[PDB]
Amino acid sequence: FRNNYDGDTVTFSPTGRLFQVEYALEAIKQGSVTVGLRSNTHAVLVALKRNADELSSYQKKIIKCDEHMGLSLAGLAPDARVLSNYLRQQCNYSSLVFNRKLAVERAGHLLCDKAQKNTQSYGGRPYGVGLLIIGYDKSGAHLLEFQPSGNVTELYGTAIGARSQGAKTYLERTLDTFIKIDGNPDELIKAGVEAISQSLRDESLTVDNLSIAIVGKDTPFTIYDGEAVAKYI
Amino acid sequence: AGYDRHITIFSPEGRLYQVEYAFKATNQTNINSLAVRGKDCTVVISQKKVPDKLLDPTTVSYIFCISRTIGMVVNGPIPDARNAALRAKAEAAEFRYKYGYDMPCDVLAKRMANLSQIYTQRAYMRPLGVILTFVSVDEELGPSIYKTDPAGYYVGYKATATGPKQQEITTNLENHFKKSKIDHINEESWEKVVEFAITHMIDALGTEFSKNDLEVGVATKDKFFTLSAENIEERLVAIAEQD
Amino acid sequence: TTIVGVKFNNGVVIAADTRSTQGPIVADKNCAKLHRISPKIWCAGAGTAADTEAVTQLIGSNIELHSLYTSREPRVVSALQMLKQHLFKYQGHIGAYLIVAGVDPTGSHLFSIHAHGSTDVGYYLSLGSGSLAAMAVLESHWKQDLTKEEAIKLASDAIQAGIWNDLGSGSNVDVCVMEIGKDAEYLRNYLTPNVREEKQKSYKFPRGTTAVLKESIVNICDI
Amino acid sequence: GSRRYDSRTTIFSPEGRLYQVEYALESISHAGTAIGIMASDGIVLAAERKVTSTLLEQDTSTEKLYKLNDKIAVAVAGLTADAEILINTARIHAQNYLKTYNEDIPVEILVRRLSDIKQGYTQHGGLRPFGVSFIYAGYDDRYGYQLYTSNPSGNYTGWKAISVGANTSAAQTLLQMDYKDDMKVDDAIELALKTLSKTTDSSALTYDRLEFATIRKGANDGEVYQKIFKPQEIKDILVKTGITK
Amino acid sequence: MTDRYSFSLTTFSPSGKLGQIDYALTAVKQGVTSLGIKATNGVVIATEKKSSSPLAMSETLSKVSLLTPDIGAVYSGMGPDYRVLVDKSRKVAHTSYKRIYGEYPPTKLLVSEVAKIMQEATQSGGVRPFGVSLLIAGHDEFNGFSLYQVDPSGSYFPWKATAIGKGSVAAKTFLEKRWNDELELEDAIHIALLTLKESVEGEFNGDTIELAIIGDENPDLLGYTGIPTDKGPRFRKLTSQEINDRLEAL
Amino acid sequence: LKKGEVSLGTSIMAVTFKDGVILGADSRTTTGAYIANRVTDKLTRVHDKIWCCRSGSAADTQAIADIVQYHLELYTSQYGTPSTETAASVFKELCYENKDNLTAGIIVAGYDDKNKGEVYTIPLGGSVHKLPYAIAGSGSTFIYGYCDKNFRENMSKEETVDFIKHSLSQAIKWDGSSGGVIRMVVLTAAGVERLIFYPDEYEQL
Amino acid sequence: SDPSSINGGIVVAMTGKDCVAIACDLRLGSQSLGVSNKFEKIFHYGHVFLGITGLATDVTTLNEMFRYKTNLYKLKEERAIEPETFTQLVSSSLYERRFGPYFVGPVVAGINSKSGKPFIAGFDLIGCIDEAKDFIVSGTASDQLFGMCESLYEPNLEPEDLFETISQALLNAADRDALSGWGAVVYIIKKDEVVKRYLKMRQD
Amino acid sequence: GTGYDLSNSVFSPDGRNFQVEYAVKAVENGTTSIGIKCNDGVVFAVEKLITSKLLVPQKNVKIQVVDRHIGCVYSGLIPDGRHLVNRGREEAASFKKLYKTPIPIPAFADRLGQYVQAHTLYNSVRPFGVSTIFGGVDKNGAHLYMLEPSGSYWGYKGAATGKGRQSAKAELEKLVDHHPEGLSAREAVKQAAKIIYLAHEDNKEKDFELEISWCSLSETNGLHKFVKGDLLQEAIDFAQKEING
């Protein structure tokens, strides 16, 4: 039973979900929560940095991948690393060769294929990681949700990591306000810190180890760390 | 028996699960085909199963043109039939490129027979459930029917029938070939051979057939051609107006 | 050398000389140039003796293999295609210039192959150093409709013309007649149009002029 | 799936040696006998031929006795098939050594290549081991006569008399007792022919149901002259010993 | 894809058995009667070639293959297995003796090659042996006339006379008495016909029996209708008409 | 390295007429000044309704053409009947990547029943060029004026038959590497018709 | 430098009657300075004798190769290598190396173990087989050797008289060289004894 | 659990392995796509499900081009669809470079088709599990093809799939039957919208976004285009008309 659709990448179900996809979806939640919201001129990521040991020191877990691109993770960190590795390489090859700056949709599609080849051999594997990728290109602002299941939707707002549903319900409500507010950073950032505080219900909110990352028309890729998140709590 | 589905080992039976079931599953499309040779022609008539009005009635095919002379009817599931068709088409052209001579029936049979045997020997490819009826009017071998079956066994036939109603068709061909005392049709004009074929087919399968229920492929010396809807009608028309 | 080919209405005839030379001196009067590939593909070879023999044998092993594999008679049209592609691949760094002839249930065949990677068709064809005299004879007395006797007779006159006016060509003449009805008749030494050479007599050496520094013996097996 | 259709048996037993290897040994002990006797003026090899009948050709007894060299020969205990692959590779290894150093291969040097491949066969690939043991008969000009044995476990030893294949215990017991080092070829043959008798239970033993060879000094060589006996030569020596069996 | 079955699919047990082989040996028995006689005055092979459908012709079926012009082979077992192994057997015979050594192979050395392929497809994982046993009959000046069996095991042995397929034990027995050291090729064709008569009746006619001989030959097909370089190959396979004619005088 | 080299009749053409294309050639191989071939088939079928004229080096053209033949057989069986433009590209690809060894002057002319007759001319180095008619080889410059002025579309078969026989018979006379038979190939939907006329015939006619 | 005439060499083979004869020089040089009067060029395999002329490096490399081929052939077959067979294997080994270096002229002599008849055959670097039963010569002075042999030989010679033909043919052919001096040997081969006789001759 | 559910390195007793059967079942619980063949073109439409107001209208697209004149939409498992298309592109480009022409639809079909068959003859390489409705116009007309999991494809004149298949197919055959094949390309856009709107009635616990495209010989001038602007508003109008509104 278990052993039919677990480790076996070649099998199918009448439903089309294997055990390996449902575990992967659970793995995303076991990382820390990170929320996404965007207008049409900016895209924001608000992410909580909460240490997992007593002595551990805070380190960036939003990683700038290019001038016009980055991602934040939620889920498994090795799994996240390999993909980020391939994407930085991919970014370079497009820029040298075709001068092409990627839109999110294009990268995404690439990302699905990569996972797909590794779910067609027993010696490769599926992943365990979701990613929210922001970027600003000439089609405006973008926020994308990447899933190991290969479901890619470009959204106005989302959340992944634990306790997504706090933030989603707030994000669908303040939707209409935020999307029509263009050229103004500060309101969208502030609103992201409020969203993420509804994801938390019993877990701390840190006033110097929150990290907010933004991209846009008037903003090249900046992560605000330490002090500089203060005036948006 | 053995346990052929989990490891590639033999059975003391001599015949394996992959071979045994390939013998069975070759009909589920509700298909019947026969091939007869004329004195100097070869005719294939095959049931054509257009089951819907969502499909064009002439994209549904089961007779493939492998070469310019050679025809191949595949009796099997349609993915397996096309898998065989693709390979057969390359081997036919590759043989002409290297050896300077178009493909005959028997050499194509042999190549594929060897392939099917290898994939049964492998534990890293599946074999297919296809029965391939290769037909032509070869330049040296005369009129030809060579039919392969799954196993990697093949042999040459007088005439042949395929489908669950193989038996019904057989008794009609037998009766004619004994009567005439030759193992080919006395007739020598592909029209009259096509017409004869249909006659024995109506009789065996017990339903009068339309043009959209048949699909005709004709082989002659140095050419292969398929008969269209109008073309099939002209033959049918006579069988409906004689007793 | 001189090698020819002539088509007749009932078969095809090939002919050759078998002389090999080292300078003017006749190393070998007989040394094969009509090569059996099969009992209905025989082949006449010119250029370098070593390349022509070797490369036909290479083709031959694989052709004898192909005829068997595919369970059918050998074919000139199969050998032809393989020779061209192989000579092409090496770009004619193998100097074998062949006239391949043969008979099948599909007719009489006559082709020639240049080492350049070219194949040819004709109705009479020739190659060799004696190619120019030989072709002259072939092209003139061939006429529409032809017989065994006019074809062998022609074949003979052709190889002689090349013996006579090209003096890098001599010795024995071997002919092989491939009929549609028959198979092949190899007629070894069919015409021997030239003969042995003068002797003036030669004489016992005296033992006061023949000296042996020292004597030993060694065994026939030391292996 | 098919990552669990792996036999996983070319891994260790707790018994200190691989499953398949130990099981294979059994297979040897159920096929033909080879006996190796090293003498002080030869090396005598005897093997009892497995199936002998009229339907077989009885005049052939090289079915398990192959000479690898001019002065090295082997005896097979195991199955024909398994053997052939090592025979061919030992033959080439002989020629590589000959060519590199301008001298013939020493018996242990040759043994050691064969044994490293036998081990190899389970060490790379997961594939199954052999089902053959050789007893090697050879001369080298650095130790006198050498007579060795290798097994698909890749362990090899030298012995002054050994038997492999079926009925190892019985033959070895008798050999240790009658052994001497002042024996000659002919004294060994007589000995060999007694031992073989005592392990085979019969009315009579015939000359065509044996495969025999001895490698003696000779009288056409200061080397060693390898004499491969065929049925009719087996018949002669059977008279000479006066041992009818 | 590859790399999933890299354990051998023969393994041992304390009875030493190799699974695949025992099953495959059984297959040979279930073939048709094929036999070999060395008459020590040639070699004669005969087998049954038989229909499997009323509209299957038998004159498109042969069980006798030429491996080289002067070595012939016959079998019992699986049809496909025999054709594919035969292609590979042909390959080595032609490339490695007729180009390298310039001549036709010696039988016993060709027996070593064919064995090695079969033993190899057992030793390597992911694939099975061939489920056939072949009898390889050949002639050479050096060795005389010869006959070997090569098993599905990749073991070999020589056999003065043998039979394989259905009715193996009785066919070999009757034959052994009728087999003399010095035996006339015509009598040796009768004995073969006689044996195959005992296996089958009610479909036993001479034009369904395929017999081939090592000894008499036709020079006129070897391109020596004209003056010979030499006599050439000794195998020549009978047509049906020759077989039927002798069956009347059986 | 090829030792010696070979040459062909170098005045080749495809002419469009009433119902298709009629393809015309002279044939002659020479190897130096040795007349390797009086007659030749260099009138090459690459598909049943699409033939070509081969010119340039004998060894090279034949070697290419065989490869084109393999692709267009496989092409038919799988992807449906070719076009003149499809054949032309395949010929070109093989010339261009290996223009380091190849000298092929190709006219591929074929008949389609929705494009009518089509002439695609691929010179040395290889580039596909669509024209309504072609002349090629090196003897073509000299008949450029004739051809342009008397070229007419939808001319009677009898009249085109004369026009090709005449066009070449003039070309062959004034040019020197031309010679041997004039062979012609009529391509319409009724099939392929083969014409051969020997030296003594065409000179006169 | 020279491609093979650094050290030179010549080889002659005759047929007699139940008998054959093969003779060669024993020169080794370094360009035109003769350095040694000894270097054997004739080796044999079973009972078929192989003399190889050319460059010393190429005789050595071939000699070790033909040992390798003869031995495995010998082992499988339980039977020695035969003149007739040996000719073909030499052709086939040489044609593979016509694209490699090789600047050799081997000559083969023997008596068959399968029809009792004399056998000689000749090879060049090209690998043209020279089918002969009269004499066959190879080497630098092969042209001259052909003239000497064509005149001097008379058919059907017994070992002593055969010996005299070959020994004198080689001596007078060699006298118009310096690249064929420094001693020379004749082997007169029967299928039961081989007599090896050193001749006395020129040097620089 | 039979090795006819864990491996495709064998033939099944049902002539197909269970996992391929399962791919066919998962297409049907999925999303609806149709394809309408007409006398001068083809029209494509797909239902894009709306689950949140967080999605953006037409900045996620399901109909993706191959070449410039063949339009591809598929229903079923998202990752498998990317991979199929990526392949579809590599074939299409190779064809354009090599033969100097846009690729025919029966040709293009054989190339994808052979690749879907490949991944269904290996014991560890995943099958595809999308059904692709695809097609376009070439130099002998318009063609509509539909490709399945199993590698099965035929030409269609109308095609339907998904959750709302039953409904969709009903309206679709009525209209195709009524028409010579489908009438004008223009008329077909509206019709197409009705089917998708009608199929949406089978799933009202979600919203849809109607998405149409077309590829028409003289009504797109050989190109595949998205259907938008006025042409999308009109098809909506027609749809809400019949299905009350």
UniProtKB/Swiss-Prot annotation, chain A:
Kindly give the Gene3D superfamilies that the UniProt entry links to this protein: Glutamine Phosphoribosylpyrophosphate, subunit 1, domain 1
Q: Which GO terms describe its cellular component?
A: nucleus; proteasome complex; proteasome core complex, alpha-subunit complex; proteasome storage granule
Q: Which InterPro entries does the UniProt record give?
A: Ntn_hydrolases_N (IPR029055), Proteasome_alpha (IPR050115), Proteasome_alpha-type (IPR023332), Proteasome_asu_N (IPR000426), Proteasome_sua/b (IPR001353)
Q: Which GO terms describe its biological process?
A: proteasomal ubiquitin-independent protein catabolic process; proteasome-mediated ubiquitin-dependent protein catabolic process
Recite the UniProt keywords alphabetically: Cytoplasm, Isopeptide bond, Nucleus, Phosphoprotein, Proteasome, Ubl conjugation
Q: Where is this cross-link: Glycyl lysine isopeptide (Lys-Gly) (interchain with G-Cter in ubiquitin)?
A: 190
Q: Has the keyword Iron-sulfur been applied to this entry?
A: no
Q: Which residues carry this modification: Phosphoserine?
A: 13
The question of whether Lipid metabolism is a record keyword is answered with: no
Q: Where in the cell does this protein reside?
A: Cytoplasm; Nucleus
Protein function: The proteasome degrades poly-ubiquitinated proteins in the cytoplasm and in the nucleus. It is essential for the regulated turnover of proteins and for the removal of misfolded proteins. The proteasome is a multicatalytic proteinase complex that is characterized by its ability to cleave peptides with Arg, Phe, Tyr, Leu, and Glu adjacent to the leaving group at neutral or slightly basic pH. It has an ATP-dependent proteolytic activity.
The Swiss-Prot or TrEMBL record describes its family as follows: Belongs to the peptidase T1A family.
Q: What else is known?
A: Present with 7210 molecules/cell in log phase SD medium.
Identification of the protein by name: Proteasome subunit alpha type-6
**Source gene?**
PRE5
From Swiss-Prot, chain C:
Taxonomy, superkingdom:
Eukaryota
Compartment(s) where it occurs, according to its Swiss-Prot or TrEMBL record: Cytoplasm; Nucleus
Query: Which SUPFAM superfamilies does this one have?
Result: N-terminal nucleophile aminohydrolases (Ntn hydrolases) (SSF56235)
Family assignment from sequence similarity = Belongs to the peptidase T1B family.
Q: What does this protein do?
A: The proteasome degrades poly-ubiquitinated proteins in the cytoplasm and in the nucleus. It is essential for the regulated turnover of proteins and for the removal of misfolded proteins. The proteasome is a multicatalytic proteinase complex that is characterized by its ability to cleave peptides with Arg, Phe, Tyr, Leu, and Glu adjacent to the leaving group at neutral or slightly basic pH. It has an ATP-dependent proteolytic activity.
- Give the multimer and partner information: The 26S proteasome consists of a 20S proteasome core and two 19S regulatory subunits. The 20S proteasome core is composed of 28 subunits that are arranged in four stacked rings, resulting in a barrel-shaped structure. The two end rings are each formed by seven alpha subunits, and the two central rings are each formed by seven beta subunits. The catalytic chamber with the active sites is on the inside of the barrel.
- Protein name per UniProt: Proteasome subunit beta type-2
This protein's gene is called PUP1
Swiss-Prot record, chain D:
UniProt feature coiled coil, ranges: none
Where in the cell does this protein reside? Cytoplasm; Nucleus
Origin organism lineage: Eukaryota, Fungi, Dikarya, Ascomycota, Saccharomycotina
Describe its function.
The proteasome degrades poly-ubiquitinated proteins in the cytoplasm and in the nucleus. It is essential for the regulated turnover of proteins and for the removal of misfolded proteins. The proteasome is a multicatalytic proteinase complex that is characterized by its ability to cleave peptides with Arg, Phe, Tyr, Leu, and Glu adjacent to the leaving group at neutral or slightly basic pH. It has an ATP-dependent proteolytic activity.
| Subunit comment | The 26S proteasome consists of a 20S proteasome core and two 19S regulatory subunits. The 20S proteasome core is composed of 28 subunits that are arranged in four stacked rings, resulting in a barrel-shaped structure. The two end rings are each formed by seven alpha subunits, and the two central rings are each formed by seven beta subunits. The catalytic chamber with the active sites is on the inside of the barrel.
NCBIfam families, sorted: PRK03996.1
Fetch the CDD domains from UniProt.
proteasome_alpha_type_4
Which coarse location class applies to the principal site listed for this UniProt protein? cytoplasm
Q: Which PROSITE patterns does the annotation name? A: PROTEASOME_ALPHA_1 (PS00388), PROTEASOME_ALPHA_2 (PS51475)
Q: What name does this protein carry?
A: Proteasome subunit alpha type-3
Q: GO CC terms for this protein? A: cytosol; nucleus; proteasome complex; proteasome core complex, alpha-subunit complex; proteasome storage granule
Supply the gene name: PRE9
From Swiss-Prot, chain G:
Q: What does this protein do?
A: Non-catalytic component of the proteasome which degrades poly-ubiquitinated proteins in the cytoplasm and in the nucleus. It is essential for the regulated turnover of proteins and for the removal of misfolded proteins. The proteasome is a multicatalytic proteinase complex that is characterized by its ability to cleave peptides with Arg, Phe, Tyr, Leu, and Glu adjacent to the leaving group at neutral or slightly basic pH. It has an ATP-dependent proteolytic activity. This subunit may participate in the trypsin-like activity of the enzyme complex.
Q: What is the lineage of its organism?
A: Eukaryota, Fungi, Dikarya, Ascomycota, Saccharomycotina
Q: Which PROSITE patterns match?
A: PROTEASOME_BETA_1 (PS00854), PROTEASOME_BETA_2 (PS51476)
Name of the encoding gene: PUP3
Write out the annotated subcellular location.
Cytoplasm; Nucleus
Q: Which residues carry this modification: Phosphoserine?
A: 30
An example Pfam family from this entry, by short name, is Proteasome
* Family membership: Belongs to the peptidase T1B family.
Q: What is this protein called?
A: Proteasome subunit beta type-3
> Which is one Gene Ontology cellular component term of this protein?
proteasome complex
The species this protein was found in: Saccharomyces cerevisiae (strain ATCC 204508 / S288c) (Baker's yeast)
